[PDB]
């Protein structure tokens, strides 16, 4: 329940910069939430394995080279319509207070458990 990730700082913005980033097999990512302004960075498609994965692996510890280190969770993912490739990731930074609502996989009446890192208020996942 703890993924590790490192990020190359990102300072160029726009369609040209994003195309240049993606041509060398990497993903633009943003992190926001809580106090402090957001952080823009670049991750690698190999580096992300919490996306193509069965469970909701909370507590992504991100070390951004130009910044400090944070504990966040997946907030939004953008896919390409045709190739289904990952084109953008947005992370929400979880703090001690301010509980965050997320989706937790259901086993048969079970779950994976969210008490630490995130506070409470887990909705559901695959409620079929």
């Amino acid at each position: 329940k703890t993924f590790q990730l490192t990020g190359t700082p990102r300072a160029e913005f726009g369609k040209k910069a994003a195309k240049a980033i993606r041509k060398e097999d990497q993903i633009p990512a943003v992190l926001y939430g809580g106090k402090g302004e957001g952080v823009n960075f670049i991750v690698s498609q190999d580096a992300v394995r919490n996306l193509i994965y069965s469970p909701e692996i909370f507590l992504v510890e991100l070390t951004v080279e130009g910044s400090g280190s944070y504990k966040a969770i997946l907030k939004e993912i953008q896919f390409h319509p045709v190739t289904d490739r990952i084109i953008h990731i947005d992370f929400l930074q979880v703090t001690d207070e301010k509980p965050v609502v997320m989706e937790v996989p259901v086993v048969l009446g079970h779950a994976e458990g969210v008490k630490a890192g995130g506070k409470l208020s887990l909705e559901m996942r695959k409620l079929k």
């Binding site: 996306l51 193509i52 994965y53 069965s54 045709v82 289904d84």
Partner: peptide, 8 residues
């Protein structure tokens, strides 16, 4: 193209 859900 055949596709499957990514959390499968």
């Amino acid at each position: 193209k055949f596709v499957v859900r990514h959390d499968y």
